[PDB]
Amino acid sequence: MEIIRSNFKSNLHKVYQAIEEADFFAIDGEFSGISDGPGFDTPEERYQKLKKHSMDFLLFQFGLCTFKYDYTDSKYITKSFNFYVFPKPFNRSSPDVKFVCQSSSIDFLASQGFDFNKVFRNGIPYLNQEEERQLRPVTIPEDQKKFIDQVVEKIEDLLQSEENKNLDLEPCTGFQRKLIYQTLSWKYPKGIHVETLETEKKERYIVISKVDEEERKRREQQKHAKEQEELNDAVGFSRVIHAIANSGKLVIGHNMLLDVMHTVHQFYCPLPADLSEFKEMTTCVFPRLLDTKLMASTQPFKDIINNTSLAELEKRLKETPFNPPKVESAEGFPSYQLHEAGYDAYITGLCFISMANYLGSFLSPPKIHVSARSKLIEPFFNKLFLMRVMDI
Amino acid sequence: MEIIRSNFKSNLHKVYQAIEEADFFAIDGEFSGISDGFDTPEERYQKLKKHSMDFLLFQFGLCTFKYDYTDSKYITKSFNFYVFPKPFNRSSPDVKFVCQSSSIDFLASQGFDFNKVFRNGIPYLNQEEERQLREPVTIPEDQKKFIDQVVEKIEDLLQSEENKNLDLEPCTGFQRKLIYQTLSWKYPKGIHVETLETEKKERYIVISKVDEEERKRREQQKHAKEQEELNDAVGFSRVIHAIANSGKLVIGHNMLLDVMHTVHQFYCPLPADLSEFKEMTTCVFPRLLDTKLMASTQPFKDIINNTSLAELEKRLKETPFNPPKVESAEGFPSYQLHEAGYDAYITGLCFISMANYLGSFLSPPKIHVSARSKLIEPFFNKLFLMRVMDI
Structure with missing residues (x-):
């Protein structure tokens, strides 16, 4: 579903319900751009560069794909959403937000059909934690x-x-x-x-x-x-993020640092002065993370996977030993081929599922299906890649 | 009409043609933003250059006016060109520009189609970038x-x-x-x-x-x-060149940022001195006039109390002014929501209302004053920086 300004509140229950029912979600972002100009960096040094030269860009499409297993059918039911967000200034005292755009980024999205009017003409607004308190004779x-x-x-x-x-x-x-x-x-x-x-x-x-x-x-x-x-509306899409954070459910991504940085920077709070406190702040929004690039880089998956790009990942994970999981979308919900956040989160989830059930092939007896709550998957949780594998 | 990348080449003949037949043009820009007291013109120029030219001019509005001495009426063609930088392989510069939320939202409230800019906008190259891409x-x-x-x-x-x-x-x-x-x-x-x-x-x-x-x-x-392919990458700059090579009067309103943006994108990145800028501005706009300044100067200052485009287009229909007798050229669209073309078109009618009025001070008073008239020369080539500035 294409969720925008005029139909956000009208759909919020449906989203909440999706989040509440889900066994796990998968997320992705689409940005205004990547870097405004620019190897031995430390994670903290690198974090600092990212904060300076990537955060002035905008996450303006948030892709969220819900995944709920049905043990009768042995299949996953999914619900993918695309939220278009734009910092539409609420009051006359709100900040007038300036952001940056990278022509090659805009160009690529344009080449995939991205509807910029859905962001710039009718995007869901939002506020961070502090912009919410601030606004409250x-x-x-x-x-x-x-x-x-x-x-x-x-x-x-x-x-x-x-x-x-x-x-x-x-x-x-x-x-x-x-x-x-x-x-x-x-x-x-x-x-x-x-x-x-x-x-x-x-x-x-x-x-x-x-x-x-x-x-x-x-x-x-x-x-x-x-x-x-009016107030509780203007917090806007941040309500969705709140709901994910509070869900306690596993959030899945692929090569997800900027997804996470941007998410927390725009909807939670502006990125702090230090990597260390950023990790904490990240365990607020995403207390249970998993990147699929790193999972497909770590054993036992390293032994058979040579390219860990999302594109190659989903190609590979349909062939032996991996089985493509049986999946179907919720009645009423759309189905699936050009790029968009929603679809990328979806493909990301299929990759995870396919790797998860593979770990189950090594048990005695072999389990065709492995839970996201399974403990076999826990070793791969909360590792993000800065200049090396990093715990969160 | 509405002119975008997949539409430009085919209509280029109409644009060049309207430009050649015209008595004068009216232009207006629309930016992705405007900006991220006792300053001198140079001090300000410097500040404008750093804090404003990193925004994009992504819609250029052109309106040509050609007087019909026979039918006693002005005839007009008007255009919106949507413009984005992108083209030609990996060796090319990847532009990073800024957007102002307040500017973007306002344009949204007027039905601006951001897909015409970002999904099918006419590409372009300044002098240097063109000069460069032309090299058993x-x-x-x-x-x-x-x-x-x-x-x-x-x-x-x-x-x-x-x-x-x-x-x-x-x-x-x-x-x-x-x-x-x-x-x-x-x-x-x-x-x-x-x-x-x-x-x-x-x-x-x-x-x-x-x-x-x-x-x-x-x-x-x-x-x-x-x-x-090469001269499709130069793209919209060709229209800026066509305008410059013509000599004709280019009319604007509060145009400092229109001009600045035009030469920065379609001619050459603005130079370090204010004085070098004044020189470039003559290349691109040898003959230029600002309706807001014209309106803030006698004999109009004594009669108009607000020189903004909206309030000015209202006052210039009231006595002692006469709205100009005007008509779209056969085959072109007619005219309300804000947009480069229409803001231009309105800018033109304001100029004409004012110019003709100048003629009433003659004896005999003429009802129609040409864009080449001697009565108009005192308002030419003047922008406002921090004071009235000659170009």
């Missing part, structure tokens, strides 16, 4: 006497007459508007609510209305209600 | 009968009519060598050896046809497609 001159008598006389033809009527006065001058407001403050102190509405242009007509004192409070706790909505 | 026979016994049956198939086609193709069934790289390596002796002219691939990547050999007959009937189309 009476004289009437002789020449107006009849004018005001008339108005009071109408207001008495309102307090009596039946129907929840609205008396709306025909346009008058600012002076007369002042004399009217003042005259109603000592003549109808409670039970009447005055307003200055606009027909086409320049607020010139007044609306007087019979307004209960209990209904002043209805409209207020109704206005406050829509206010907590 | 021992056959082993076990293969004897294989090569000989190959020498046959080619002979039984060489002196024979219905001359279409010869497709050798797939062979081993060693034989594939030997076939090539033998036709070096046997048939040194007359034939074209070539290892193609089936849609399934498998290597075929082909001899097919002739030598010295289409050895330059196709080498002509090869080099005419080499020079063709």
Whole structure:
């Protein structure tokens, strides 16, 4: 499903439900670009370069593929989503976000059909952890006497007459508007609510209305209600990420450092000054990670896999000894060939599954199916590649 | 019209033609952003250069105006060109540009199609980047009968009519060598050896046809497609060159960033001095006018209290101004949401309303003032940097 601004909240339950039911998810990103210019680096030194020359780019498509096993059918049911995100400034005090684009990146996505209007014209907005807290006496001159008598006389033809009527006065001058407001403050102190509405242009007509004192409070706790909505909306796609973090479920990627860096930098909190505290901060968002590149680089998979690119991986993992897992999408959900985050997460998940069930081939007796909760898969958890294999 | 990469070449004749027939042009840019007090023009120029030219101008709006003395009316053609840098292989620069969220959102609210920029935008090259991209026979016994049956198939086609193709069934790289390596002796002219691939990547050999007959009937189309591809990469800069080489008046509104961006992308990366910039600006826009400045100067300053394009296009219809009698040229679209072309088009009508008014001070007062009139010269070649600046 193509989830965008106008259909995000409308789909949020479906996503939540997908996340809650899932045995594991698979994720991917699509970026504005990679680097704005530029071997013996240390992880911390490298981390520092990435933070400087890659974080000014944008993750503007988040691909999430849910995977739920069905032990009756022995098959996985999937649900892939593509979320288009864009930092659409909420208030008039919000930061005006500047980001960078790499022409060859835009060009490649363009070559795959990426719809930039889905990001730039109608992208789901978002806020990070901090941007959320942050965001949380009476004289009437002789020449107006009849004018005001008339108005009071109408207001008495309102307090009596039946129907929840609205008396709306025909346009008058600012002076007369002042004399009217003042005259109603000592003549109808409670039970009447005055307003200055606009027909086409320049607020010139007044609306007087019979307004209960209990209904002043209805409209207020109704206005406050829509206010907590506007806020809780603007956190936007970060709600999805929150839901994944809290799920506790295994999150799968392929060559996923920038996926993760970008995810946490835009939806959680701006990347901290140090690799060490970044690892911690990462165990917040993604307490249970697995990269499929490294898994397909580590034994017993190293012994048979020569290219660990996502592309070659999914080619390889259909042939012996690996079996392509039986998979199908949820009724109602789309199916699958050009590149997009959603599909890449999907392909990523098939790779994982296919490797996982392979580990099971070495048991006695051999298990055709291995869980993501299996402990055979735990050795491959929380290892990311900076300048070498790195624990998280 | 709406002009994009897959649409540009075919319409280039209309664009060059509107440019030649015009009395003057109106241009407007649309950027991916605007920016990431007692400054001097140079100090500011410097600051503008660093903090603004890393944004893209990705839509160029051109509107030509040509007066009809007969029908007493202006006739207009207007264009949006969508422009992105990308083209020509690995040796080419990979541009990194910036985007401002506030600018992008506003353009979104007006129906701007970002796919026309990013998915099918007209490429381009500045002066320098263009200038730059413009610079034996021992056959082993076990293969004897294989090569000989190959020498046959080619002979039984060489002196024979219905001359279409010869497709050798797939062979081993060693034989594939030997076939090539033998036709070096046997048939040194007359034939074209070539290892193609089936849609399934498998290597075929082909001899097919002739030598010295289409050895330059196709080498002509090869080099005419080499020079063709090159001058498609220069792309939109050709229209900027066409405009510059014309001399004609180029009208803008609050144009400093339009001009700056135009020459930075389609001519040459802005130089270090403000004074060097003023020189380049004359190459590209020898004759230029800013409706906002014109409107902020007598005899208009005494009558107009707001020189913004929206408020100006309203005031220039009211007395003592007369909206210009105007019409789209036969075959072109007519005119509202914001866009380069329309902002240009409006910029043109503001200029004309103002120019004609100048004529009312004559005796006899003329109702129509030409773009070449002497009354207009005092407003020419003036931009606002931090004060009114001559160019």
